[PDB]
Design a protein around this nucleic acid. Structure first.
Ligand code: ZN
Ligand code: ZN
Ligand code: ZN
Ligand code: ZN
Lengths: 81, 81
DNA sequence: CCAGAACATCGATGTTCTG
DNA sequence: CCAGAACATCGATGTTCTG
């Protein structure tokens, strides 16, 4: 099969560095679209949801927060090292 | 009293006794679809998310439970007028 | 190699309509 | 008045190309 190198904010099979963190494709555009305005979402739980290839589309509030945490930031490759 | 505006499972405008319970189109529909379809409903938290006009898309696993909880039955007494 | 656009594709959901 | 059915929407997530 494939081995594995899991994305820093779900756990899917990562694609490359995205806006600064090893994330998959989805985390890639999810974060971009979230950041580019209006990320007002409410959590249905107590601000700590679990994540993964499925549960990830359950709560954008938490996913966006997990992006932020991983380090994902808009002008990543501008500075890299 | 008892008719009463608020959806018993997501407090939006209810439309009438749907499947047992005063409820809305969405939930109405959601219940049937829930009970006779294939799905991967899993909750990201610890199965007690708030269902609400918005969040109710977050945890269908939780909604469906709220459904079951509130009485909604498929093969049930069709009434309310 | 990563950014960001086009498409195209589904499953989930929602509303209006019609028996 | 309600079940169900027929639309019609939303939103994720491919894939595939640029620069
Ligand atoms: Zn991811
Ligand atoms: Zn959450
Ligand atoms: Zn409802
Ligand atoms: Zn839940």
């Amino acid at each position: 099969m494939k081995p594995a190198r899991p994305c820093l904010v779900c756990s899917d099979e990562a694609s490359g560095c995205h806006y600064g963190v090893l994330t998959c494709g989805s985390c890639k555009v999810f974060f971009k679209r979230a950041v580019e305005g209006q990320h007002n979402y409410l959590c249905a739980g107590r601000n700590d949801c679990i994540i993964d290839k499925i549960r990830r589309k359950n709560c954008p509030a938490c996913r966006y927060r997990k992006c932020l945490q991983a380090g994902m930031n808009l002008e990543a490759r501008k500075t890299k090292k």
